[PDB]
């Protein structure tokens, strides 16, 4: 009659000191391991950059001024040059002969074509380019359309080309661009629209190859008259899917899931079901918005969605994020001495060089690769270890009875 209490005393301590660890299991806890090391090889990121000015003044034709003149605030609602014009009398004449629609027959007009043709040409802006002593050409830049207009992406890596790498830190083993923003080609600003800009220079974004560029929201700036240094540090974050975390691709418009991809997606669907068209920089296969559609539907609907609406788009957290810690710095260019030299080399005035020339150095530092990853704190393996150790006693007692 004591054996029955040696079996009940054995079964008791089994579940009694066992149920305390299974509750910790169904909590689905997660440890976040950190590791900041230096990789022997480093997959250099994609570098998308855009000019703040959207359309070249010398590329805007009479027909273009007719279709998108009002959108660019170069014309009023009645196809006339606004009286509020604030330009010199030299561009006024050139612009008036262009706004002369007497006996003019409007040819067909396409926005995507306008951006592509009237946009800034990487072949004129790129005065110099290197990547690890390797000289690169405009053919290394993949054309990408975004809110700013016709932009470009170095080391885009999609399309059949392999993504570049770097194995050493410092400027010597990174991207170095010398651009000519061409202020002389900047459109006159006579009004305030989503296609006009008070600023001069470029907007840049450093992102993973498989992450679409949201350059108008998440980009940084680079000004003319300065050589900008950008020390970067690649940070890779990994999250756990639920039951452990909140993270988680539909593959509707983009290959990999990205917060940006998700937003670009929502912006597109929204702008489509509101205007029955998409903006030049948007995915999908909807009719491209016309200059008129931009002013009266496209721009407004998009601005509202992004700046005012917080109900429509609900983007979940990605299970894989690649973040680049940027550290900027600059020096003046040109020096009082090298000015007259750069002026002759590019057949420009000395003053011009100071207002237009730009140099950008994007690279990594010594410590270049950091990882913040969520690991499963308590897995099934280790669970059965301690709970399994209590079985050897319940089995040995189940025989004596």
């Amino acid at each position: 009659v004591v054996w029955a209490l040696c079996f009940m005393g054995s079964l008791a301590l089994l579940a009694l000191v066992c149920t305390n660890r299974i509750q910790y299991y169904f909590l689905y806890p997660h440890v976040t391991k950190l590791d900041e090391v230096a990789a022997t090889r480093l997959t250099f990121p994609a570098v998308t950059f855009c000019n703040l000015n959207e359309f070249r003044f010398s590329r805007v034709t009479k027909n273009d001024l007719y279709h998108a003149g009002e959108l660019l605030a170069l014309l009023n609602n009645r196809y006339e040059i606004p009286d509020t014009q604030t330009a010199d009398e030299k561009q006024l004449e050139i612009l008036q002969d262009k706004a002369n629609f007497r006996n003019f027959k409007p040819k067909p007009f396409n926005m995507l074509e306008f951006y592509d043709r009237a946009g800034h040409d990487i072949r004129e802006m790129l005065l110099s380019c290197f990547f690890r002593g390797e000289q690169c050409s405009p053919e290394d830049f993949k054309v990408v359309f975004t809110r700013y207009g016709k932009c470009y992406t170095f080391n885009a890596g999609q399309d059949g080309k392999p993504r570049l790498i770097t194995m050493k830190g410092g400027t010597g083993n990174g991207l170095e661009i010398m651009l000519d923003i061409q202020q002389d080609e900047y459109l006159p600003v006579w009004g305030e629209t989503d296609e006009t800009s008070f600023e001069a220079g470029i907007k840049v974004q450093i992102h993973s190859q498989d992450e679409p560029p949201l350059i108008d929201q998440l980009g940084f700036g680079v000004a003319p008259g300065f050589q900008t240094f950008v020390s970067c540090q690649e940070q890779r974050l990994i999250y756990l899917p639920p039951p452990w975390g909140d993270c988680k691709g539909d593959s509707e418009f983009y290959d990999t899931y990205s917060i940006t991809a998700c937003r670009i997606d929502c912006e597109t669907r929204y702008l489509v079901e509101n205007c029955n068209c998409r903006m030049v920089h948007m995915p999908g296969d909807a009719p491209y918005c016309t200059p008129e559609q931009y002013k009266e539907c496209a721009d407004p609907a998009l601005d509202f969605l992004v700046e005012k609406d917080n109900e429509y788009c609900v983007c979940e957290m990605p299970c894989n994020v690649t973040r680049y810690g940027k550290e900027l710095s600059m020096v003046k260019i040109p020096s009082k001495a090298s000015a007259k030299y750069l002026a002759k080399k590019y057949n420009k005035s000395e003053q011009y060089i100071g207002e237009n020339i730009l140099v950008l150095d994007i690279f990594f530092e010594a410590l270049n690769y950091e990882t913040i990853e969520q690991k499963k704190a308590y897995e099934v393996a280790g669970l059965l270890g301690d709970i399994g150790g209590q079985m050897g006693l319940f089995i040995g007692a189940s025989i004596l009875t």
Binding site: E192, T193, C275, P300, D303, F304, K308
Partner: protein, 37 residues
């Protein structure tokens, strides 16, 4: 007269249709826009 969705409400901040507001945009002119809480 009533100004519809996404339209210019310049000098007419009160001529928006039902459920709209005259919203001043950060980079452009005012626009009648769906009112939000």
């Amino acid at each position: 007269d009533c100004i519809p969705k996404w339209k210019g409400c310049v000098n007419r901040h009160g001529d928006c249709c039902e459920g709209l507001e005259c919203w001043k945009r950060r980079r452009s002119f005012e626009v009648c826009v769906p009112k939000t809480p």
